[PDB]
Amino acid sequence: DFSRNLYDIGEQLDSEDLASLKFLSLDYIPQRKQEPIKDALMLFQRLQEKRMLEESNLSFLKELLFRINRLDLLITYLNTRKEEMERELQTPGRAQISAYRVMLYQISEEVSRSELRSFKFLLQEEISKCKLDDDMNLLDIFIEMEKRVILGEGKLDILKRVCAQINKSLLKIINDYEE
Amino acid sequence: DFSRNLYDIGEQLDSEDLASLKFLSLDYIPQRKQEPIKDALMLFQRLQEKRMLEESNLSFLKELLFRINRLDLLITYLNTRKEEMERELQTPGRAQISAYRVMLYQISEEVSRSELRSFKFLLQEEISKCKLDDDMNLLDIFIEMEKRVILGEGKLDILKRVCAQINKSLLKIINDYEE
To answer: Which positions carry the propeptide annotation (chains A, B)?
Structure first.
């Protein structure tokens, strides 16, 4: 009955919902595994194991479902309305998923696919201090690599490492040169 | 006459040819400028200034044109055939553009536009040790940023820096959170 509900709910969660649910559960169900959670039932299995989900304790599951906007599943399988959840989670200290975690999730949802790619380039730059964007051509990069003294006549290692990962013909261009 | 030739040749070089020509000239006409070379005549102007191009010294111009595969211009304006250039440049120590420079140029030409984007991601990783690719989703990145201790409840600075560069709504999500 509770078991039936968990399966019926699990059946309606797609791979996108699962990813979000796993992320929002990170402060409880640790990133670290080589036993990756591959569907919603496996996620529910671990929540039960951590004693955060059971017949008489649905509060974490309801909060998860609310935060990923599955209001359909909340009312259909848990007889729970939007406003019940709002009132619950507006009471200070009652939310189990931190506003921090929810905030990153909402960012994830707002980001376009081109914006995501910009995020990647912008992020790497913060760490590496090399400016890269979708519009740069390869020659300008070479010129930059040469100012970084990571590219040069006798410094083809990084170049070869990158090119070997990309295309056979490329690394052959390099190797043909080297003698 | 020589002047006329230089203009006629310059007129037939497009912005892609110019980029290549500037790159191949890097060991002579230094990267460093705030006087950027914006067409082929400006490039020829500087070559003349460095005494690497004049009426009686066409050898560097011919080598440039050969290396960017403008065999049409070589024969039409410089009365020079492919095999003259090959014989010239097969003689050891006679090439003025280094095989290293030519090699990078040929890489540039072989790289597809998707391969280029992979080059960018792969390059940044060599420097930053953060693995990024086109297929990663934002949540997995957040999870990685959290292992790097560059993201967290009281560490939103890098996040805000990246997001402010991308979209107003994004930074608003972050700011709305912070109180």
So the answer is: 1-179
Distance CA B54, CA A45 (A): 80
Contact B142 A104 (CB under 8 A): yes
Encoded tokens for A79 = 């007889």
What is the domain class of A1-110 according to CATH?
Answer: mainly alpha
- The closest of B102, B126, B2, B18 to B56, measured between CA atoms, is B2
CB contact under 8 A, B23 and A116: no
Question: Contact B150/B137 with Cβ under 8 angstroms?
Answer: no
Angle at B141 between CA A118 and CA B138, to 5 degrees: 60
Residues facing residue B57 across a β-bridge: B54
**Resolution stated for this PDB structure, in Å:** 2.1
Left (φ > 0), alpha (ψ -120 to 50) or beta: where does A93 sit?
Answer: left
Left (φ > 0), alpha (ψ -120 to 50) or beta: where does B97 sit? Answer: beta
**SS3 state of residue B54:** strand
**Residue closest to B47 by CA, chosen among B111, B118, B97:** B97
| Closest residue on chain A to B105 (Cα) | A139
Chain A residues whose beta carbon lies within 8 Å of the beta carbon of residue B177: 99-100, 103
